[PDB]
Amino acid sequence: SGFKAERLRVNLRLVINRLKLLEKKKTELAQKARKEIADYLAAGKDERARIRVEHIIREDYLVEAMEILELYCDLLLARFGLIQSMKELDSGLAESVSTLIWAAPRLQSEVAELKIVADQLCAKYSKEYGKLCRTNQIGTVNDRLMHKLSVEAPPKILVERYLIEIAKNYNVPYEPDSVVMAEA
Amino acid sequence: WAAPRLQSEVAELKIVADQLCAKYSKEYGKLCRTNQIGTVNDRLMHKLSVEA
Amino acid sequence: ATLKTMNLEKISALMDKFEHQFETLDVQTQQMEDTVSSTTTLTTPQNQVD
Amino acid sequence: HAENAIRQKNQAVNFLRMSARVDAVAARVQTAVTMGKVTKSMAGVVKSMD
Amino acid sequence: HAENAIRQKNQAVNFLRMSARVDAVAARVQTAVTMGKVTKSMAGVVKSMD
Amino acid sequence: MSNMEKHLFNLKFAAKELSRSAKKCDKEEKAEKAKIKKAIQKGNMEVARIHAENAIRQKNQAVNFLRMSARVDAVAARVQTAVTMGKVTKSMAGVVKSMDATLKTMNLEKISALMDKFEHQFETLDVQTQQMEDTVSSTTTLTTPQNQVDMLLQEMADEAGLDLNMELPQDELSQRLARLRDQV
Amino acid sequence: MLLQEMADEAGLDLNMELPQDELSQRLARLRDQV
């Protein structure tokens, strides 16, 4: 009881559709954002440009994270026979199932169906496994994805390198923070 | 053997299986579904396996 | 309101059913045409068409 | 189109043959209608002259 | 447009093929209607002449 | 008119109203510019400045209305998709429901039966035509003697230059497959 | 089943077969702790 295979199958397909669409939209919005950084740098407002590129870095990391989750949903669909057949969790699926349960509370603001995918996977493999996933006590959640959805501020050198590349591309004079470039 | 695997797509295949079980008896039908009867085609069972 | 009454899971279902019901209508056309073909076999001998 | 051409070729012969048979029957009922009119007229003449 | 062109190319063949099959059936019910009229007329002639 | 069609109608109307407002501002920038020239020629510098401030004001109003019109069009274009795709979704839902009913009342087993009966009943009508024609043939045997028909065919064939003798009673795969049946 | 059917039509996610404040909970925990 609780678990319904078709709820999981339908919602996995929906999650892929929604992620596939959000990646495109967010990629386009990053173009518009980078133009705005060049405008701030041209206006000599470098100290603000630094804080505006933190938004760009976070959206870029998020788009990369959405690509990883798209892949794990597509993997659970490809090997959906195993999910439905066994009662134990296979090794091949452990990364995917644990990561999707871990990610859902972070992403479910944007990708509402991802909550239902997580809830069904917890109904299948039990609530206790679901709790061990959400904290990564299960030690199986994908490390790169957890990095990409971290709440920490970007490294100062990443911010500076972003400004250097954007400034170069839009032919705007920029001089990077000497202290940060030295610390690197 | 195949009907329970395929009957999502090929609905009539259920009726074919049900009639063949009515003909040759329910017990033969059960021995088929597990291949205890040792007669189900091997290549077909491979091709409908759930393994990656 | 409309995204409640026809949510994406319900759309997914409806589209699956739509597709599967046109598979069935293809099966039905095929066997109407096979019947008509056999019905008028003597009016179109194969060798004459060839 | 080839199968239609050969089909309508063969339908034409079946209709032509049936038309010939129904004409042959129509030609016989014409004799029956006319020879009935003649027989009643002769019966009437016989009665009048009697 | 390329996908529309190829789609309507293939729809045209399916409609043409179905039209040919429905004609073949219409041609057979024409025989049944006409041969029914002939059979009733012959039945009527037989009764009149009897 | 649906509740959403009303909203679309009002959005399309607001977009045009803003577009007209931009056109009115442009035509009044031209009108005020003409009045600046007249006031300068008459030395009325105070009145010239009032028209100059009107010209520059209506220049800038025109851009704001034009920009707002573009934004309201973009929204009107999206609610058009929502209205049309709603009509399509309801029509598909209706088709699915109709076909579900007809595929119940005339399922494929019932169609199979009906088609078998159709074919078998036209076999019977062929048997009946044959014996009507055989009766009519025997009925009018004396009107068409065989030898007279044969002679007319031969005469017409002679005129046509056709060599086929018409008095006489005028595939190999079938023959070989028959020989196989005899050999076993 | 009738409730679940009507909820499905309404698009409501609440499963109707199942048996479907924190200050009260905390004040209860206090009573247990003393």
UniProtKB/Swiss-Prot annotation, chain A:
The keyword Nucleus applies. Residues 1-165 are annotated as: Interaction with CHMP1A and CHMP1B. The modification Phosphoserine is found at residue 1. GO terms for cellular component: azurophil granule lumen; centrosome; chromatin; cytosol; endoplasmic reticulum-Golgi intermediate compartment; extracellular exosome; extracellular region; Flemming body. GO terms for biological process: cell division; collateral sprouting; cytoskeleton-dependent cytokinesis; ESCRT III complex disassembly; establishment of protein localization; midbody abscission; multivesicular body assembly; positive regulation of collateral sprouting. It comes from the Eukaryota. It is found in: Cytoplasmic vesicle; Cytoplasm, Cytoskeleton, Microtubule organizing center, Centrosome; Midbody; Nucleus envelope. The modification Phosphotyrosine is found at residue 40. Its main location: cytoplasm. Keywords: Cell cycle, Cell division, Cytoplasm, Cytoplasmic vesicle, Cytoskeleton, Nucleus, Phosphoprotein. GO terms for molecular function: cadherin binding; identical protein binding; MIT domain binding; protein domain specific binding; protein-containing complex binding. Interacts with CHMP1A, CHMP1B, VPS4A and VTA1. Interacts with SPAST, STAMBP, and USP8. May interact with VPS37B. May associate with the ESCRT-I complex. Interacts with MITD1, in competition with VSP4. Interacts with SPART (via MIT domain); leading to the recruitment of SPART to midbodies. Interacts with SPAST. Belongs to the IST1 family. This is IST1 homolog. It comes from Homo sapiens. The gene is IST1. The chain holds residues 4 to 187 of 364 of the full protein.
From Swiss-Prot, chain B:
It is found in: Cytoplasmic vesicle; Cytoplasm, Cytoskeleton, Microtubule organizing center, Centrosome; Midbody; Nucleus envelope. Transmembrane segments: none annotated. Belongs to the IST1 family. Interacts with CHMP1A, CHMP1B, VPS4A and VTA1. Interacts with SPAST, STAMBP, and USP8. May interact with VPS37B. May associate with the ESCRT-I complex. Interacts with MITD1, in competition with VSP4. Interacts with SPART (via MIT domain); leading to the recruitment of SPART to midbodies. Interacts with SPAST. ESCRT-III-like protein involved in cytokinesis, nuclear envelope reassembly and endosomal tubulation. Is required for efficient abscission during cytokinesis. Involved in recruiting VPS4A and/or VPS4B to the midbody of dividing cells. During late anaphase, involved in nuclear envelope reassembly and mitotic spindle disassembly together with the ESCRT-III complex: IST1 acts by mediating the recruitment of SPAST to the nuclear membrane, leading to microtubule severing. Recruited to the reforming nuclear envelope (NE) during anaphase by LEMD2. This is IST1 homolog. It comes from Homo sapiens (Human). The lineage of its organism: Eukaryota, Metazoa, Chordata, Craniata, Vertebrata. The chain holds residues 105 to 156 of 364 of the full protein.
UniProtKB/Swiss-Prot annotation, chain C:
Widely expressed. Expressed in pancreas, kidney, skeletal muscle, liver, lung, placenta and brain. It is found in: Cytoplasm, Cytosol; Endosome; Late endosome membrane. Residues 32-50 are annotated as: Interaction with IST1. It comes from the Eukaryota. Probable peripherally associated component of the endosomal sorting required for transport complex III (ESCRT-III). ESCRT-III components are thought to multimerize to form a flat lattice on the perimeter membrane of the endosome. Several assembly forms of ESCRT-III may exist that interact and act sequentially. Interacts with CHMP1A. Interacts with VTA1; the interaction probably involves the open conformation of CHMP1B. Interacts with CHMP2A. Interacts with VPS4A; the interaction is direct. Interacts with VPS4B; the interaction is direct. Probable peripherally associated component of the endosomal sorting required for transport complex III (ESCRT-III) which is involved in multivesicular bodies (MVBs) formation and sorting of endosomal cargo proteins into MVBs. MVBs contain intraluminal vesicles (ILVs) that are generated by invagination and scission from the limiting membrane of the endosome and mostly are delivered to lysosomes enabling degradation of membrane proteins, such as stimulated growth factor receptors, lysosomal enzymes and lipids. Belongs to the SNF7 family.
Swiss-Prot record, chains D, E:
Probable peripherally associated component of the endosomal sorting required for transport complex III (ESCRT-III) which is involved in multivesicular bodies (MVBs) formation and sorting of endosomal cargo proteins into MVBs. MVBs contain intraluminal vesicles (ILVs) that are generated by invagination and scission from the limiting membrane of the endosome and mostly are delivered to lysosomes enabling degradation of membrane proteins, such as stimulated growth factor receptors, lysosomal enzymes and lipids. GO terms for cellular component: amphisome membrane; autophagosome membrane; cytosol; endosome membrane; ESCRT III complex; extracellular exosome; kinetochore; kinetochore microtubule. Keywords: Cell cycle, Cell division, Coiled coil, Cytoplasm, Endosome, Membrane, Protein transport, Transport. Widely expressed. Expressed in pancreas, kidney, skeletal muscle, liver, lung, placenta and brain. The lineage of its organism: Eukaryota, Metazoa, Chordata, Craniata, Vertebrata. This is Charged multivesicular body protein 1b. Its main location: cytoplasm. Belongs to the SNF7 family. It is found in: Cytoplasm, Cytosol; Endosome; Late endosome membrane. It comes from the Eukaryota. One of its GO terms (molecular function) is protein domain specific binding.
